[PDB]
Structure 1
């Protein structure tokens, strides 16, 4: 019939084409109502502070603080050197250094050989 939508990492599945969107089961209703309850509690807790006349400042979000703490300070306490982190740390850490070393070294050896053999055109090159 119709071409089936193939979702990707950068093009997700639509809400209207997802089979779990049409679940009418009571456990999904309980999960949706419990998510609505958490969101309504956080909403009320936010807008009781947001609408306060005496408040003058920043309504601190512990979710934002929690995110910025996870992105920076919690990383090394939760690092374990294993096969994955060592093979990724050495591929992306010293791999490009070896690569650009051999590229620039081969280029400058070739250019130095051409200059000392009098082959590189260096006719008007006096700024360096």
Structure 2
């Protein structure tokens, strides 16, 4: 009949064609009421301190401080040696080093072999 939208990680499924928008069950009602409750509570606790005339400063977000402390300060104690992390620390840590090392060594051995034979065009090359 009609083409289905197939999702992507870089182009996600819309709000309309997702089936969990068109569920009318009671647990969806209660989860939406709980998310409305938490969002309204945090909205109120925000815009009290936001409109507070005694406060002349920065309304600190614990979520933003939590995100900044997550991106930098939770790195090392939650590092465990296993298959995936060590194979990615070897594949992405020393792999491209070996790649560029053999490429640059091959290229400079080729160039030095051409130069010591007197075969490379080095006529007006006096800046180096």
* Structure 2: runs of 5+ lacking an equivalent: none
**RMSD (Å), alpha carbons:** 0.5
TM-score (norm 1): 0.99
Structure 1 segment 79-94 matched on structure 2, within 5 A: 79-94=79-94
Q: Distance in 1 between matches of 2:83 and 2:24?
A: 44
Q: Distance in 1 between matches of 2:40 and 2:117?
A: 79
| 1:90 Cα deviation after fit | 0.2
TM-score (norm 2): 0.99
How many equivalent residue pairs? Answer: 128
Match of 1:78, SS state, is coil
Structure 1 segment 1-128 matched on structure 2, within 5 A: 1-128=1-128
What is the CA deviation profile of residues 60-97 of structure 1, one whole-angstrom value per residue up to 9, with x for unaligned ones? 00000000111101111111011111100000000000
* Structure 1: runs of 5+ lacking an equivalent: none
Q: Distance in 2 between matches of 1:18 and 1:86?
A: 38
Q: Distance in 1 between matches of 2:119 and 2:75?
A: 54
Q: Distance in 2 between matches of 1:112 and 1:18?
A: 62
Q: Distance in 2 between matches of 1:80 and 1:101?
A: 29
Match of 1:31, SS state, is helix
